[PDB]
Amino acid sequence: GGKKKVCYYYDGDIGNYYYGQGHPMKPHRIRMTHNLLLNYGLYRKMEIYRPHKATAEEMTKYHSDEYIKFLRSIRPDNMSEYSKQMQRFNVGEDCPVFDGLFEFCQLSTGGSVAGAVKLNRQQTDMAVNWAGGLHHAKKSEASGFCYVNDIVLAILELLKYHQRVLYIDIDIHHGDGVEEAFYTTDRVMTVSFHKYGEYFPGTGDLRDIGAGKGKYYAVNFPMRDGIDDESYGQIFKPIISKVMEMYQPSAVVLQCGADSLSGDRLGCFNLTVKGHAKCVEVVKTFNLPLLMLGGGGYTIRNVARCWTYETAVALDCEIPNELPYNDYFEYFGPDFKLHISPSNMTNQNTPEYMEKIKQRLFENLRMLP
Ligand SMILES: C[S@@](=N)(=O)c1ccc(C(=O)Nc2cc(-c3ccc(F)cc3)ccc2N)cc1
Ligand SMILES: [Ca+2]
Ligand SMILES: [Ca+2]
Ligand SMILES: [Zn+2]
């Protein structure tokens, strides 16, 4: 038990990067998150660090030299000359070229790798990088608004000191970039809960379980539209408890993508901030070194609420539902409260469905040594 030492990573420049008019990814939400939790006074309880800008050397621990060299070079002013290379690396539409793109990648990545180093040195119990969690980026390809996979890079850092690392992903989307990087090893177990069925990125079937040495070390829980706190609570603690029992990791990475929240502009789930944060509480109780990362989230007032509350959860610090004044106070109307209510959308996930999928995953976990 006991309260944990928390190190938190934030660069105030992050909020000034702009994906372009109408693009749903708003890096400003990270600044909103920071400003809200500062105004709750959570800076009194944790160490706040500014991450370094991760280097191309650091990024090619996973990504190919040619992809990182492209990301270093491409700019809005030289786009027309790179039209062939942009298609090769899936840059240009959902993953646009914008001013400062490579510096933006260096910032999100630097916080995750810095947090992993801090955990490796046993200088913190938990490290938090809300700017991170870019689980879709591939070895040589951007995808799903992500360019550089900070998670894979951070896990590679943890693996220097940890035989087994557990990755848990509560973003509404399948963590395909992370699962793919570690699909054939048993040194990382990936566990993703996600909407599945004609949904981005198209992977994460129940029956994708890993390959080779990694067979049974990939776990996927496919879900339907409208899942609520009750349905998620049916299955999250039982599955993570069984994973902990069988896999016995020595470090954990938790991707806390907030596009699984009720009312997300892009997502189709119905979780509240309390139900989302219950996952952090569950993982926290195993008392393992823990890297907590951001992810998706497109209704940015709810992103700020979610990650502020989950920072408080990490700190075992109770905070009031009445929002303190802050630089973005108008975003939180008309209620100006921290917690959110679910919508009346139908939950397509029946209780029988939840239990059945869980039972099938339990069968797979029995195949571990
Ligand atoms: C058009 S779509 N329907 O195909 C569609 C819709 C939403 C996403 C999506 O949520 N992506 C995502 C991005 C990040 C991320 C975080 C931080 C950051 F700086 C850059 C990216 C993290 C996690 C997810 N999952 C991808 C595709
Ligand atoms: Ca997920
Ligand atoms: Ca694996
Ligand atoms: Zn997502």
CA of 274 to the centre of ligand 4 (A): 19
Name the binding residues for Zn(2+): 171, 173, 259
- The upper half-sphere exposure of residue 169, i.e. CA atoms within 13 Å in the direction of its Cβ, equals 32
Is residue 257 within 6 Å of ligand 1 at its C-beta?
yes
The approach used to solve this structure was X-ray
**Spatial separation of the C-alpha atoms in residues 141 and 89, rounded to whole Å:** 4
Q: Which atom of ligand 1 is nearest to the CA of 297?
A: 10
- Is the link from the previous residue into 51 a cis peptide, with omega within 30 of 0? no
Kindly report the protein residue whose alpha carbon is nearest to atom 8 of ligand 1: 144
Tokens representing 107? 């910032």
Is residue 94 within 6 Å of ligand 1 at its C-beta?
yes
CB atoms closer than 10 angstroms to residue 186: 18
Ligand found nearest the CA of 155: 3
32: burial class by Cβ within 10 Å (0-12, 13-18, 19+)?
buried
Do the beta carbons of residue 117 and residue 80 sit within 8 Å?
Answer: no
Strands 47-49 and 6-9, by their bridges, are: parallel
Kindly report the protein residue whose alpha carbon is nearest to atom 3 of ligand 1: 200
Kindly report the protein residue whose alpha carbon is nearest to atom 10 of ligand 1: 296
| CA distance to 155, 165, 279, 308, per residue, from 53 (Å) | 18, 25, 30, 24
Residue corresponding to tokens 């239990």: 355
Name the binding residues: 22, 26, 169, 171, 173, 182, 185, 188, 192-193, 217, 259, 265
Going along the chain from its start, the domains and CATH numbers come out as 6-365 (3.40.800.20)
Is residue 171 within 6 Å of ligand 1 at its C-beta?
yes
**Spatial separation of the C-alpha atoms in residues 251 and 97, rounded to whole Å:** 35
Do the beta carbons of residue 9 and residue 108 sit within 8 Å?
Answer: no
Do the beta carbons of residue 71 and residue 358 sit within 8 Å?
Answer: no
Do the beta carbons of residue 108 and residue 30 sit within 8 Å?
Answer: no
Hey, which residues are catalytic here? 136
Long-range contacts of range 85-93, CB-CB < 8 Å, 24 or more positions apart? 89/140, 89/141, 89/142, 90/141, 90/142, 90/143, 91/142, 91/147
Cα 112 to chain centroid, rounded: 11
Is residue 267 within 6 Å of ligand 1 at its C-beta?
no
- 158 backbone dihedrals φ, ψ, rounded to 5°: -60, -35
Burial of 216-232, coded b for 16+ CB within 10 Å and e otherwise, reads bbbbbbbbbbbbbbebb
The alpha carbon torsion through 241, 166, 317, 310 (nearest 10 deg) reads -100
What HEC string does 188-206 produce?
EEEEEEEECCCCCCCCCCC
**Resolution of this structure in Å:** 1.8
Max CA distance (Å), the chain: 57
| Beta partners for residue 108, in sequence order | none
Tokens representing 167? 């990755």
**Spatial separation of the C-alpha atoms in residues 253 and 175, rounded to whole Å:** 12
What HEC string does the chain produce?
CCCCCEEEECCCCHHHCCCCCCCCCCCHHHHHHHHHHHHCCHHHCCEEECCCCCCHHHHCCCCCHHHHHHHHHCCHHHHHHHHHHHHHCCCCCCCCCCCCHHHHHHHHHHHHHHHHHHHHCCCCCEEEECCCCCCCCECCECECCECCCHHHHHHHHHHCCCCCEEEEECCCCCCHHHHHHCCCCCCEEEEEEEECCCCCCCCCCCCCCCCHHHCCCEEEEEECCCCCHHHHHHHHHHHHHHHHHHHCCCEEEEECCHHHECCCCCCCCCECHHHHHHHHHHHHCCCCCEEEECCCCCCHHHHHHHHHHHHHHHCCCCCCCECCCCCCHHHHCCCCECCCCCCCCCCCCCHHHHHHHHHHHHHHHCCCC
Tokens representing 114? 């810095």
CA of 137 to the centre of ligand 4 (A): 12
Ligand found nearest the CA of 167: 3
Tokens representing 61? 């621990």
**Spatial separation of the C-alpha atoms in residues 63 and 340, rounded to whole Å:** 38
Strands lying side by side in the sheet with 251-255: 47-49, 6-9, 126-129, 290-293, 251-255, 165-169, 188-195, 218-223
**Spatial separation of the C-alpha atoms in residues 221 and 196, rounded to whole Å:** 9
CA of 81 to the centre of ligand 4 (A): 31
Pocket test for ligand 1, best of 13, 94, 136, 147 (most atoms within 8 A of CB): 136
Is residue 136 within 6 Å of ligand 1 at its C-beta?
yes
Ligand found nearest the CA of 217: 3
